[PDB]
Amino acid sequence: GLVPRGSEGMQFDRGYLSPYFINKPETGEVELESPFILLTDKKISNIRELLPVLEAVAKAGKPLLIIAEDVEGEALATLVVNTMRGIVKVAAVKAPGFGDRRKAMLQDIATLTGGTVISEELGMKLEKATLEDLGQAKRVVITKDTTTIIDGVGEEAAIQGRVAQIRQQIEEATSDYDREKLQERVAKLAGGV
Known part of the structure; x- marks a missing residue:
């Protein structure tokens, strides 16, 4: 079925890892404007790992969103x-x-x-991640339980190619669950542009 609106943003169900990130106290939300985005599947437990990026981010004078397996201790x-x-x-x-x-x-x-x-x-x-490794977007809105990435700045053809890839997998899927979960991804990418 058709979707009435357009680019609401890519949303996933993961909220802030600490209440001290909240910068919108009345809504209980985090709102980052033109944020750099760190992407990793690693668990961040030590601070030695984030120093180089934080220093760089601090020197650029730009907000940062860290998306990791987990960020703790x-x-x-x-x-x-x-x-x-x-x-x-x-x-x-x-x-x-x-x-x-x-x-x-x-x-x-x-x-x-x-x-x-x-x-x-x-x-x-x-430790070696640079500013070129970080993604960017117009705005990031984080609530207790969700994260929304509005207007990613990636290449259109690259974003298009990613969606074509997911469509390709959907065709080869053997289950409605698999196709549905794959369909999710497309919808998430579509919202981000």
Whole structure:
């Protein structure tokens, strides 16, 4: 069935990893304007991993959205202290889904935002991630339980090619569940443009 509106944004069901990211107290939300986006399937537990990116982000004077497997312990605490002091405007959320769908969805967001996934399996380090590796968007809105990426800045043909790929898989799918979950992804990418 038809969708009445257009680009509401790519949304996934993962909210803020700490209440201290909230910068819209009356709504209980996080709103980042023109944010850089860090994408990774790695679990961030240490702060040594995020320093290089945070310093770079801080030097550029731009907000940052961290999408990781999880951001915890000392790492989360250092993001909270730096965001509270106004050194960096950061927010961290978990990567959507699990298993293989999480990695595919991380790639969907990379392609939409023109970012590069810092993958565990490839041997990529957060430490060497640069500003070119980070995706970008007009706005990011994070609630208690959802994240919305509005207007990713990725290449249209690249975004188009990603959707063609998912359509290709849908044709080869053996289940309505598989086709439906694949259909989700297309709809998420469509909202992000």
